[PDB]
């Protein structure tokens, strides 16, 4: 009747001692923050474990997460200023057993390597093959130049921030990264999303939209970018935008299906507030609040697009925010 | 710190008033209990829903379950002795909302008409197109004439009971339905399953067995049963019983990746036990726990296929039991 009984197909993600120093190490956290919204993302889409993105979220309550996948940075201390380890553990929280354990050393440029290496062990730890649109769409929204990955996941940590000031600098580092990399077509329509959304946050003129348009008219038929969720993404927001519901409903959804994250949870609770749904809204903001409880989703729901009442429109959440 | 986040995207399903008037009611019940585990198992292998099927579990506990589907029993007392109608509902655990309420009349016939309209509008109500896969498994999974409905759901209910006269009554029912429909491949594969796992219990003479081996050979390979999870439990049970454990675990394997059941995590504990790995049989046992706790599926732990120590071999559920 009091006991919680745990779900092994429910996994949280945590970050243990981010401020490994007392300072940074500005990249190494990015980084972490980056593979740990891959595996979440990864696993939500094209597995039936739940996953929460705990990273962002300061708090301890209680769940019924089965296992808990921690990455946790760790200091040798065989000399001052030495660069910390990433200590990534997965946890079986029903008998307390470790399933995975790694110590990876990053280096600028063996990002992808070890990243690689964590996908390829919890595939085996958690009896999980990864289909071949996974393996397709990984190599597709990730730079294999090396030099530039650790400009990608600032930006990536910018886009989860979701303010005005963080889209500016993620829009530049994107832009850097498109003129380094031109054949990175997905940094070109990273870029337009968050330009997209700079535009609702700071109107552009009308040559300029119609500039931002036409890119996004030529981003969206690149065969290349068929099937990959930040289509639908792009489809989605400027549909938001231009208030047309039906066609960013149909593009959100397909989104959906393609990625199960918290961004796209927040853009479908956008297009049921325009429509007009509230209780449809509440439902898919409290999704992606599921998904990656914290500060970043949190401002997203309220602010992303156009503002939103949590008090009014997510009660729920308002609630469980304020007890 | 002390609250728990409710999980849109996890359901409950409950019963209500199963004792509708005092007895019964011998159709009704087990038809119920068949529509409650399809729409789990519906919602489990094709959505990103994870539904927890407490149809037979009779105790309230804490969950992070963000919405509850109850089946309940209504009695119109209009005169006595009056058949109950079926009251299905879908509850926002969130914000108290209701999504859906049907009320339905059964009228032994009409039993796969209700289902589909309780489908059509859970697909409308979730956001949940359902894909073609699920609809090419009901048409295969289910019996066409409606006559044989009943005592489909009988065995079905006999099968998530477990114990040999459960299964002898199973298989005496399958088999009639097999005389009466020999269309109807599925029934043919459900009896040679549950006769496998008979022949656990009550082992067969060697004459008999090979006749089942020979049977099962038969089946496996029946191209209208291709892409159906049976095939894989029937081959994963034979192998279990022949101690073929990597044939076992690829055949379960492939079963889960079609269903996933509560029978299917069942068995795959099994096999983990016999290739002598109690820390993952635990995991599977937990998982079939949660997707229908109750006594069905510990019946299945315990007693399936070969005894198995639920103190030793799965410490966490034991403790869960106890407190």
């Known amino acids: 009747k009091s006991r919680i009984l745990l779900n092994p197909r429910d996994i949280d993600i945590n970050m243990v001692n981010k401020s490994c120093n007392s300072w940074s190490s500005p990249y190494q956290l990015s980084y972490a923050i980056g593979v740990g919204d891959l595996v979440a993302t990864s696993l939500n889409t094209f597995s039936t474990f739940m996953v929460h993105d705990k990273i962002n979220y ?23 200023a030495q660069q910390c380890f990433m200590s990534i553990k997965l946890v079986d929280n029903a008998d307390g057993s470790t399933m995975l354990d790694k110590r990876y050393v990053i280096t600028n440029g063996n990002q992808l390597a070890i990243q690689n290496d964590l996908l390829e062990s919890l595939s085996k730890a958690l009896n999980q093959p990864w289909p071949q649109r996974m393996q397709e769409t990984l190599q597709k929204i990730l730079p294999h130049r090396g030099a530039l990955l650790t400009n990608f996941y600032q930006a990536h940590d910018y886009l989860l921030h979701g303010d005005d000031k963080s889209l500016n600098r993620a829009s530049e580092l994107l832009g850097e990264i498109v003129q380094s990399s031109p054949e990175f077509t997905y940094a070109r329509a ?118 939103t009442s949590v008090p009014y429109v997510v009660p729920y959440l308002d609630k469980f925010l304020a007890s």
Do not use: C
Request: charged residues 20%; proline residues 3%.
């Open 190 to 307: 990273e870029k337009a999303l968050v330009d997209i959304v700079r535009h609702s946050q700071h109107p552009l003129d009308e040559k300029q939209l119609a500039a931002l348009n036409t890119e996004i008219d030529n981003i969206v038929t690149l065969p290349e970018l068929n099937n990959l969720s930040i289509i639908y993404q792009i489809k989605a927001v400027s549909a938001l935008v231009k208030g047309k519901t039906d066609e960013s409903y149909q593009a959100i959804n397909t989104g959906i299906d393609l990625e199960m994250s918290w961004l796209n949870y927040v853009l479908l609770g956008k297009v049921y507030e325009m429509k007009g749904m509230n209780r449809e809204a509440a439902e898919a903001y409290l999704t992606a609040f599921n998904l990656r409880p914290g500060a970043n989703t949190l401002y997203w729901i309220e602010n992303g697009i156009f503002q």
């Open 58 to 80: 300061n708090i301890d309550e209680p769940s019924s997460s089965g296992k808990t996948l921690s990455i946790a940075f760790v200091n040798q201390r065989q000399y001052r």
